[PDB]
Symmetry: D2
Subunit: 334 residues, 4 copies
C-alpha cells in the first residue's frame, strides 16, 4: 500500500530506509543517489559506524538497477536532477527528500513531475509546510502536494516546549543545542564559505553555529511563534544531541511539579514521542532511541518557580528518521 | 622577592609553574607531588599535549631533591600530607593548592604549619575566601591567612556578568557551560561514585554534570548573590570551554549596545581579563589565551532588548593559571 | 555452572553480560569494593559501547542482592580477595577481572574464599595460559588457578597457529593498533609505570607495550622466540587490530593464504577465527564476539615468503566471550 | 625567490606560513576559486593545529591583494590552472597544493600561466620525485615540473636510506599510523574511490592505502621492489608515525642501529632525520619541522637481522617545510 522511494542515500536516507524496512505498514520501492553505486549502496546500508550492522535482509541482483532487501525488490536511481527520475515507473507515492539541496517548497515540487504523489522534506524549509509529529501533524490536509518534517532540533524542542506552555505558558525562552557533528562539517580546517566556523576541524573543536530550531517551534506551533530563539554548539560526537532550553513561565510551578507534568504527558498524548527519565544518562544512552525527545529530569535546574532551565535529549539521526515515517503514515490516512 | 612553591604538579600546577617561570616578579621555589618523581617532573613539564613543548630552561640535578630551571633551582617534595612539607626550609611564602583534595578553609591551613605565609587554593572552596582577579581581588585584606582563586568557570562568568549587571542590571540568569574534559573523568566507563555520569567514557560522550560556578558569582559579587544558577556539559575536548549565559535585564539595551559596552570595558578596567572579539572563532582559537574571559559577539543572540543570551570563551587551564599568579601579586602588594 | 566476578570493570561487566545471556552457565556473585550494589545496576545497565541491556536486572535488598529475572547474585564490597566468601553464596568459578591480582599466588585468595577454580582476566607471570581454540585442550582439572591471556594474544594466536601450521613462520614482528582502556588518562597525568600512558589518551597516538607476541610461544611452543612486537594506542572507545609481519618457511601466494584462513574460518576455528573480504572498519566489530577476524583486503605481501596480515578483535567483547568459553571447557573435565 | 600557491588548503596555507616567515624566499600570489580573499585572511590567521599567527597579513583592496606587513600577494579565484597569470604578478615557482592536478601534463598548465617551475604538493604518476636530504641533488634545471612526494615518503626515505646504507635491507614491510586528512568524512558518506575512506573518520581505525613504500625505490633505486606497505588512519588532527619492519643484510644490534641513526641525525641528515630517546607522543611533534624523527625507545628487534623501527612525522608541517626547502634547492641551479 504505502510505496516509498528515497532521494539521497545519506545519513538520514539510509536510516529511514532501515526504519521502513522493518515495518509492515510501509514499504521501500526506490532509492536515488547519483553519487552511490548500487553495489556501494549495499555496503553503505549494511555497515554503520553509529547504529551497527543490519540484522535482516540485504543483497543486490541486477547488473546495476535492482537490490534485493530480503525478497522485496528496491529500485535504484543514479539521477542528478529530481524531475528526471521516473518516480512512478517504480511505484513511489512518497518520496523522501533526504538530499539537503532541494529544501524549498518549489524545489521539492520537482519530484511530482517524475510521477510522485507526495514528497516529504527531511530538513526544514523556507516555505514548504512544516509538521512535527505529535504536536501539529494533525493540521496536515490532503490537498498538500509537498510537506516538510522540520529539523531534528525542532522535533525535540516543540513537543517539550508545548507541555510547558500548555500547562504553565511560556513568556520568553532562549535555547542552546549542543549538537553532534554532521555531514556538512569537515574533518580538518577547510572551506565552508557560508558558515566560516563550520569549516574548522569538526572532531577537535567546539563550534558555535546557528540553528533556527526555535522560531520554527512557532511556524508549527503558532501559539509560541516569535517567542523563542537560540543558537547551537557543534561538538565532537558522532550522534545524539541535547537541547538546553531556558524559559520564564507566566504561571508559577515547582521543579517537581513540572517534572510530574512531563511524566504525565510522557504516558499520554505524547507517548513514544516525548519521553521521561530520571537516570544519570549520557550521550551514548540514546543511540537508537526512536523517540523525538526524552526529558532529562536530573540534568536541569530552576532559578525561580517561573524561570527554569530544562534539558532534553534526542538522537538527531535515528529518532528523526523514525518521525519522517510516522508522518508519512499520518498523511496516508488523513 | 615573591618565592613560590606548588602543591600538586597536575594540569594547573605545571601550567601555573610555566606562567611563573617566565615572569620576573614571581619565582619558583618548590614543588610537592607524592606521585611524581623528580626525573618524572621534568618529562611532565617539558612535554605537553595541549600547550606544547617548553621554549626556556629545564634540567634536573641532585639525585632526587633539586631541579634546575635555567639556573634557578627549584625544590621537589614527595610528601603525602600538607603539614609534613617544610615549606619554609625552601623559601615558600605562597603555596599553590593545586592538588584538589585539600580544598576547604581548614584543609589548606595545613600548609602554614610547614612554615608558609599564605596559600592560594586553585579550586573554589566551601569556606576559604574567594576572589576573581579584576572583579573583587580588591576586597582582599592582608590579615587573610588563606585564600581561594575560585574556578575557571567563575573566572569567566563573573567579569562578563559584572559589566552586564553594572550598566543594565541582571534580574535573573541561567547559565550553561559546555566544558572540556578534565583529570576527574575516565577514558572508558568506570566508577565515579560521587558523580555517576562522570564515570562514563569522557571522550565519546556528552556528559551532563554540575558546577556551582553561578551562585559563587555572588559569593564574590554579593550584588549578584542568589541571582544566577547553572549546569555544565562535559564534551570531548582536551582544553578550552565556553559559557552560555541567559539573563533578563531590568534596563533595556540592544545587542549592539551591549556589544559596544563590552568592547568599552574590554579596553578599560577589565583589559587583559575580559576580552572582546567579533570573529568566527572556535574552540582551538583560545588555547594559550591568558585572559579570564573573551566575549564572542557573533555567537550570542537576543530575544528581547531585556532578555539576551551571551557567549564567552575561556581556556580553563591556561587563563585560570594566569589568574592565580595575577592574584598572588595583588596580595604581595596589598 | 556457578560463576562469580571479581571487579565489575569493563571486562567484568561484559563477562557478566555473556553469562547472564547464555544458559549453560549462570552468575552467582559479584565483588567490587568501589561500586555499591545500586551502582552496579546503573553501570551494568548503561554502556557507552555495547548499549543498554535488553533483559532485566534490578536491586532487591539494601546492599546484598540483585535480581536478573528472579535469580540472586549476591554483592560483595570486599577490598582483598581471601575475604570473599565464594562458598557462602556457592560460586565455584571466579573471574579475576580486577587487574591487580595477576599473580598465581595473589589470585589463589579465591580458593580460600571457598572457590574451586579461578580464571585470570589477563596474562599472568606465573599462571598457565590458554587461548581457547588453540590450546584450551591442555587444561587439567588439578590446576586450581588459571589465565585466559590477553585480547591481543587471543587475536594473534589463532592467526599465528594457522599461518605456521600450513606454511611455517620463521620470524615475526607484530604491531597492534589498539583502543584506549581504563589504564589511560583523560589528560596528561601521572603514570609512572608507563610514562607515555599518562598522556591524554584521546588526542594522541601513544606507543605502548605488549607481551602478546612473546606470549604466543608460552601457549604455542612451536614458535617460542619467533615473534615479538609493540603497540599503538589510538583515540577509539573499543576494537583493535593486529598488524603481523611474517617470514614464511614455505612459499605461498596471498590468495592461497586467504583461502587457507577461509578454510580454518569455516572449519574447526569457526567462531574463533573469522574471515572477511569487506571494506571493514573498527566500528564494524563492536559486539563481534570472535577471537580474531581476518581483514583480507587490508593486508599485503612483499614476496611469497614475506607478508603482512591484518586481523581484528573487539578487546572487550570477544575476550570476555572467550573467558566463559574457557570456564565451560574446564567444567567438562 | 617568488612563490605562488595553488590551493589554500592545509598544505597550501602551511607552506604559506613557511615562506612568509623565512627570508630567502617570498610569497607573490595565491589562487583558490573556493575561497574569497577575505576568507583566506580568516583561514590563514586561524588554525586548529598550529595556532594563530604571530605576525600580520590583512586585506587591502576589494578582492585582489592582501598585505603581510606591506607586501602584495595577489589573489586569484580561477578554477583551472592554465588560466592563472603567474607571470602577470610575477610568480616564478608554483606550489600545486590542490591535490587534483598531480599529473605532469595537468600541472603543466602553470607554465602557460607564465611560471618557470612547478612543485607538486604530492606524489605523481609521471613527475620526477625528490625527497630533500636523500635525492634532492638529482634535480636538473631543465626539468620544468616536479613533485616532492608524500609526507609518508619523506619520513620513510631518510630512515630507509640510513638503514640500508649501513646494514642493507633485504625486504621491508611498512605500516603507518596516520592522522586524518581533508579527504576523509565527518560521518559515513560516499567515497567511491576509497570505500573505507567514507566512514566516520574520528570514530574509526580505518585501513587505507599507501604508495610511499613502493615510492622509496622511485627515488632510491637501490631498494626498488624491496619495500611495500599499508596505512591506518586514526582519529587525530595531525602527526603520524611509520612502523617499519626490516630484514637486514648485515647483522647489527639495536643499540648499534640507535647510534647509527644518531650519527646521521647529528651529521648530514640534520634537520631532516631527528633522533629521540624520550617517551614521546604524537602531540610532541605538532610543529616539528623535520622530515622524520626516530623513536628509539618505541621500536623493537626480534633478531640482529630482523627489527622494527618507529619514526615520527608531522604530515602537515614537516612536509611543507620540505616543499620550500626543495624550491630553494632548485633556485640554486
Ligand atoms: N544528519 C542528521 O542528523 C539530520 C537530521 C535531521 C535532518 N537532516 C537533514 O536532512 C538532509 C540530509 O541530511 P544527511 O545528514 O542525511 O546528509 P548526508 O550528507 O548524510 O546525505 C546526503 C546524501 O544525499 C546524496 N545526494 C547528494 N546530492 C544528491 C542529489 N542531487 N540527488 C539525490 N541524492 C543526492 C549524497 O550522496 C548523500 O548520500 C539535510 O537537509 C539535513 O539538514 C539531517
Ligand atoms: N584542570 C583544570 O582545567 C582546572 C582549572 C581550574 C581549577 N582547577 C582545580 O584545580 C585543582 C587541580 O586541578 P587539575 O586539573 O590540576 O587536577 P590534576 O589531576 O591535573 O592535578 C592533580 C595533581 O596533584 C597531584 N597530587 C595528588 N595528590 C596530591 C597530594 N596529596 N599532595 C600533593 N600533590 C598531589 C597529582 O599527582 C596530580 O599531578 C582541582 O581542584 C580543580 O578543580 C582545575
Ligand atoms: N579493557 C580491555 O579491553 C581488556 C581486555 C581484556 C583483558 N583486560 C584485562 O582485564 C583486567 C581488567 O580490565 P578492565 O578494562 O575491566 O579494567 P577496569 O578498570 O574497567 O576494571 C577493574 C575493576 O575492578 C575493580 N576492583 C579494583 N580492586 C578490586 C578488588 N580488590 N576487588 C574487587 N574488584 C576490584 C574496580 O572497581 C574496577 O571496576 C585488566 O587486567 C586488563 O588488563 C582488559
Ligand atoms: N594534508 C596532509 O597532511 C598532506 C601532507 C602532504 C601532502 N598532502 C597532499 O597535498 C595535497 C593537498 O592536501 P591538503 O591536505 O592541503 O588538501 P586540502 O583540501 O586541505 O587543500 C586543497 C585546497 O585546494 C583548493 N582547490 C581545489 N581546486 C582548486 C583549483 N582548481 N585551483 C586552486 N585551488 C583549488 C581547495 O579549495 C582546497 O583549499 C593533496 O594532494 C595531498 O595528498 C597532504
Ligand atoms: S539534526 C536536524 C538538522 N539541523 C541541523 O543539524 C542544524 C543544527 C544547527 N543548530 C547546528 O549547527 O548545530 C536539519 O533538519 N537540517 C536543517 C539545516 O540546518 O540545514
Ligand atoms: S575549570 C574550573 C574547575 N571547575 C570544573 O572543571 C568543574 C566544571 C563543572 N561545571 C563541569 O563538570 O563541567 C575548578 O576550579 N574545580 C572545582 C571543582 O569542580 O571541583
Ligand atoms: S586488552 C588485554 C589486556 N592487554 C593489554 O592491555 C595490552 C593491549 C596491548 N595491545 C597494548 O598495549 O595496547 C590484558 O588482558 N592485560 C594485560 C596485562 O597487563 O596483564
Ligand atoms: S600525507 C601525504 C599525502 N599522502 C597520503 O595522503 C598518504 C597518507 C598515507 N600514509 C595514508 O594513506 O594514510 C600526499 O602527498 N598525497 C598522496 C597522493 O594521493 O598523491
Amino acid at each position: 500500500k504505502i510505496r516509498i522511494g528515497i532521494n539521497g542515500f545519506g545519513r538520514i536516507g539510509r536510516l529511514v530506509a532501515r526504519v521502513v524496512l522493518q515495518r509492515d505498514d510501509v514499504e521501500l520501492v526506490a532509492v536515488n543517489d547519483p553519487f552511490i553505486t548500487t553495489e556501494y549502496m549495499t555496503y553503505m546500508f549494511k555497515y554503520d559506524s553509529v547504529h551497527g550492522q543490519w540484522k535482516h535482509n540485504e543483497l543486490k541482483i541486477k547488473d546495476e538497477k535492482t537490490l534485493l532487501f530480503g525478497e522485496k525488490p528496491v529500485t535504484v536511481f543514479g539521477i542528478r536532477n529530481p524531475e528526471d527520475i521516473p518516480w512512478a515507473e517504480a511505484g513511489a507515492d512518497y518520496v523522501v527528500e533526504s538530499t539537503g539541496v532541494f529544501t524549498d517548497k518549489d524545489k521539492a515540487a520537482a519530484h511530482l513531475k517524475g510521477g510522485a504523489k507526495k514528497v516529504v522534506i527531511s530538513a526544514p524549509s523556507k516555505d514548504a509546510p512544516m509538521f512535527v509529529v505529535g504536536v501539529n501533524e494533525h493540521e496536515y490536509k490532503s490537498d498538500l502536494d509537498i510537506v516538510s518534517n522540520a529539523s531534528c532540533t525542532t522535533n525535540c524542542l516543540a513537543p517539550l516546549a508545548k507541555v510547558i506552555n500548555d500547562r504553565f505558558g511560556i513568556v520568553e525562552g532562549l535555547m542552546t543545542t549542543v549538537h553532534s557533528i554532521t555531514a556538512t562539517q569537515k574533518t580538518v580546517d577547510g572551506p565552508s564559505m557560508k558558515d566560516w566556523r563550520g569549516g574548522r576541524a569538526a572532531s577537535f573543536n567546539i563550534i558555535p553555529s546557528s540553528t533556527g530550531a526555535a522560531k520554527a517551534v512557532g511556524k508549527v506551533l503558532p501559539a509560541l511563534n516569535g517567542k523563542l530563539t537560540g543558537m547551537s554548539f557543534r561538538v565532537p560526537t558522532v550522534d545524539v544531541s541535547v537541547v538546553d532550553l531556558t524559559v520564564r513561565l507566566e504561571k508559577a510551578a515547582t521543579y517537581d511539579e513540572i517534572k510530574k507534568a512531563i511524566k504525565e504527558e510522557s504516558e499520554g498524548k505524547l507517548k513514544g514521542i516525548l519521553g521521561y527519565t530520571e537516570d544519570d544518562v549520557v550521550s551514548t544512552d540514546f543511540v537508537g532511541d526512536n523517540r523525538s525527545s526524552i526529558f532529562d529530569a536530573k540534568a536541569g535546574i530552576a532559578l525561580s518557580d517561573k524561570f527554569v532551565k530544562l534539558v532534553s535529549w534526542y538522537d538527531n539521526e535515528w529518532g528523526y528518521s523514525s518521525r519522517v515515517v510516522d508522518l508519512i503514515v499520518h498523511m496516508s490516512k488523513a
